[PDB]
Amino acid sequence: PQLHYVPYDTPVEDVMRILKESGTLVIRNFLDQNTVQKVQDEVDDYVRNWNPGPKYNSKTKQPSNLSLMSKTYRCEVLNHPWMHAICERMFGPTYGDYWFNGGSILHLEPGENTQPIHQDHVFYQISKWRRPTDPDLTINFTMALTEFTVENGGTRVCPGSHLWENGHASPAEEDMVPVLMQPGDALILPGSMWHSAGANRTSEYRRGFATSFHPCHFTPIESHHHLPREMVEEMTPLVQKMLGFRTLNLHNNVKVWKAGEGNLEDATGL
Amino acid sequence: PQLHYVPYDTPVEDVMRILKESGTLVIRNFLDQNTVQKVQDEVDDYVRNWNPGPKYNHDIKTVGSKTKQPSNLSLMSKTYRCEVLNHPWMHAICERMFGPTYGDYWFNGGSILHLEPGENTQPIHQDHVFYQISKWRRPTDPDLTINFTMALTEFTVENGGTRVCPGSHLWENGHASPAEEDMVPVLMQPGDALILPGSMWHSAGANRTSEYRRGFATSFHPCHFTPIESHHHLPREMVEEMTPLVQKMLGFRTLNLHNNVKVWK
Numbered sequence: 001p002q003l004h005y006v007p008y009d010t011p012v013e014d015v016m017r018i019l020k021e022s023g024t025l026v027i028r029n030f031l032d033q034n035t036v037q038k039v040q041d042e043v044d045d046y047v048r049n050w051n052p053g054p055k056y057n058s059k060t061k062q063p064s065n066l067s068l069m070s071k072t073y074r075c076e077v078l079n080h081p082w083m084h085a086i087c088e089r090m091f092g093p094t095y096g097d098y099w100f101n102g103g104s105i106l107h108l109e110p111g112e113n114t115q116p117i118h119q120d121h122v123f124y125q126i127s128k129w130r131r132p133t134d135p136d137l138t139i140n141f142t143m144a145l146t147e148f149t150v151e152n153g154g155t156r157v158c159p160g161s162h163l164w165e166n167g168h169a170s171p172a173e174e175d176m177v178p179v180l181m182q183p184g185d186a187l188i189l190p191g192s193m194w195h196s197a198g199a200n201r202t203s204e205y206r207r208g209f210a211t212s213f214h215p216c217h218f219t220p221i222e223s224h225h226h227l228p229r230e231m232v233e234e235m236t237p238l239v240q241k242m243l244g245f246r247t248l249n250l251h252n253n254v255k256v257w258k259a260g261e262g263n264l265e266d267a268t269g270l
Numbered sequence: 271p272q273l274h275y276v277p278y279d280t281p282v283e284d285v286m287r288i289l290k291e292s293g294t295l296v297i298r299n300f301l302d303q304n305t306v307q308k309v310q311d312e313v314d315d316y317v318r319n320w321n322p323g324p325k326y327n328h329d330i331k332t333v334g335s336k337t338k339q340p341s342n343l344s345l346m347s348k349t350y351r352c353e354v355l356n357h358p359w360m361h362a363i364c365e366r367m368f369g370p371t372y373g374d375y376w377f378n379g380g381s382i383l384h385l386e387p388g389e390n391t392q393p394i395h396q397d398h399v400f401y402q403i404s405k406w407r408r409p410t411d412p413d414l415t416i417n418f419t420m421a422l423t424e425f426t427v428e429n430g431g432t433r434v435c436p437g438s439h440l441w442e443n444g445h446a447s448p449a450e451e452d453m454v455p456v457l458m459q460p461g462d463a464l465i466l467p468g469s470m471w472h473s474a475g476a477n478r479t480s481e482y483r484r485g486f487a488t489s490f491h492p493c494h495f496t497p498i499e500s501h502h503h504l505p506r507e508m509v510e511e512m513t514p515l516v517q518k519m520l521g522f523r524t525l526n527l528h529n530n531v532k533v534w535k
């Protein structure tokens with residue numbers, strides 16, 4: 001197996017076949033450039049109400065959920081048709097519905113050392129029961145804000161390591177394949193794929209942001225039930241279901257996250 | 271394996287050992303008559319107006335046409351969310367069941383189990399059947415969920431008291447359901463509770479009496495599993511009256527995995 005770079009118009013069955021054979025791939029031009037700029041603008045404006053001027057003439061905010069800080073994220077990025085097409089083919093037949101697991105802005109500082117090589121599904125206890133041929137427990141879409149180079153610690157993966165067994169040792173550093181991307185490209189990251197961020201040996205930050213989804217029956221990393229309800233009703237029904245505001249359906253048609261025996265969105269006037 | 275009826279003050283690891291041996295047991299006087307009567311008073315009209323049969327269509331054809339199974343118990347009963355969900359036996363067993371592997375646990379779901387007079391026998395089933403990952407689990411693994419079926423009316427063989435097949439929790443994933451003859455009826459007075467791990471094969475009996483047989487259940491499952499019932503549609507003044515334990519049970523607090531990783535944060 002190898003690391004594949006495919007254009008945006010690659011057929012869905014080709015992307016799924018590459019995901020099954022290599023455990024990862026890169027979809028170039030996943031987002032346009034202005035979308036890349038909008039997400040950084042809204043995040044910067046959130047966590048920093050003040051920016052240093054040229055000379056001396058509430059101040060900052062701790063970062064929160066990406067859907068809270070970025071309106072383009074919760075209203076445009078989370079509606080990405082590629083993510084939903086990949087999530088449906090990955091979780092539909094086995095689990096059925098899926099929803100948002102977690103997401104944040106990647107910020108590799110200058111001089112930051114190499115991240116330990118790991119699989120994303122390590123924090124799932126049921127990963128010990130899972131076989132390499134079973135569907136993934138979660139999938140991550142890592143979008144590039146800056147360019148991803150070997151110098152600035154771009155993401156490295158090991159194609160084929162997703163088919164390793166549960167007791168397999170971590171891949172050697174010599175066999176990690178760096179993911180070279182331009183802003184707008186996305187690296188698709190199933191929870192079975194071993195990966196790690198490299199060391200940033202440059203003088204500039206390596207910036208990115210990630211989305212991630214997992215089956216309906218698994219508890220996500222973040223809860224969004226603290227977001228303002230006026231911010232909830234300006235989302236699409238699909239995004240509302242992603243962020244835990246709607247009832248989900250199992251493959252056996254049993255509904256989880258219900259409002260008693262009814263739908264959660266019906267009981268909340270959504 | 272055999273069905274055990276133990277008193278309320280039975281040692282906790284004795285209950286855990288019986289759960290490991292026979293896959294089920296009964297804790298008598300699990301609820302005092304005050305709690306049984308308060309729950310019956312707070313859900314009387316709610317069960318009265320509830321339409322029988324399944325509310326929505328799913329593949330587990332198990333809700334008979336003369337069976338009422340309404341949930342939303344915390345929203346409809348203050349005794350349920352302010353006393354029942356704080357029951358020390360539920361948490362003492364859930365800790366030893368889910369702690370050593372999954373870390374935290376929380377509320378999965380809770381329903382009223384109302385058998386109208388004339389209801390036929392329920393299909394024998396395992397409660398974790400709606401878990402897809404149940405086909406990856408082995409009998410020696412920890413349970414995916416645990417249930418506490420508490421008797422509101424008395425539970426007899428004739429009125430449809432729940433029946434269990436002790437030891438069936440050790441059967442493999444492909445083993446056939448128990449025949450009707452190997453089911454053992456559970457005889458419970460108002461107050462007793464039947465402890466049902468997700469692996470125990472069980473079913474409700476036929477209500478061949480003139481009266482309805484009603485109980486109500488509480489279920490808990492690991493922190494990393496999505497509950498069958500959400501509770502964020504409840505009024506906020508209703509959440510502020512819960513204990514910190516119940517607020518965490520019903521999804522209003524951050525959960526801790528076994529390796530100290532935050533979920534639902």
Ligand SMILES: CC1(C)C(=O)C=C[C@@]2(C)[C@H]1CC[C@@]13C[C@@]4(C)C=C5C(=O)OC[C@]51[C@@](C)(C[C@@H]23)C4=O
Nearest residue numbers: 330332378379380381395397400417487489498
């Ligand atoms: C379809 C039905 C009747 C069944 O045949 C097998 C499993 C489930 C899907 C029930 C209805 C709802 C549940 C959902 C819940 C989380 C709480 C309910 C309950 O309290 O009693 C039935 C349940 C159960 C014990 C079993 C579970 C469970 O674990």
Ligand SMILES: O=C(O)CNC(=O)C(=O)O
Nearest residue numbers: 383431432472473474475
């Ligand atoms: O009502 C009973 O005695 C048992 N009911 C169930 O197991 C159920 O509804 O899933």
Ligand SMILES: [Fe+2]
Nearest residue numbers: 118119120195
């Ligand atoms: Fe990672």
Ligand SMILES: [Fe+2]
Nearest residue numbers: 395396397472
């Ligand atoms: Fe059951």
